[PDB]
Amino acid sequence: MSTKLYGDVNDDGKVNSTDAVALKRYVLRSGISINTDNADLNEDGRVNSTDLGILKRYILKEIDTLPYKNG
Ligand SMILES: [Ca+2]
Ligand SMILES: [Ca+2]
């Protein structure tokens, strides 16, 4: 009916360290199944470290818009 998430791995909430498991598998190659659709936002794939941060940064609670920023 309604949900808020952007770039989820296991469609839990978002792609972060928590989804590092599927990440390691994804980083190595494309074998698993993840919502890579809107998982990448810097042509990386998911969260190599640049997004990971912004993720744990916005996913902290702001999870709704995600103030995508560099750092
Ligand atoms: Ca998740
Ligand atoms: Ca990314």
Swiss-Prot record:
Localization per Swiss-Prot or TrEMBL: Secreted
Chain ranges of the Dockerin domain: 2-68
The UniProt annotation places Ca(2+) 2 binding at 40-41, 46, 51
Transmembrane region(s): none
Q: Which residues bind Ca(2+) 3?
A: 40, 42, 44, 46, 51
Q: Where does Ca(2+) 1 bind?
A: 8, 10, 12-14, 19
- Please describe what this protein does: This enzyme catalyzes the exohydrolysis of 1,4-beta-glucosidic linkages in cellulose with a preference for amorphous or crystalline cellulose over carboxymethyl cellulose.
Describe the family membership recorded for this protein in Swiss-Prot or TrEMBL.
Belongs to the glycosyl hydrolase 48 (cellulase L) family.
Its name, as the record gives it, is Cellulose 1,4-beta-cellobiosidase (reducing end) CelS
Gene name for this UniProt entry: celS
Full-sequence range covered: 672 to 741 of 741
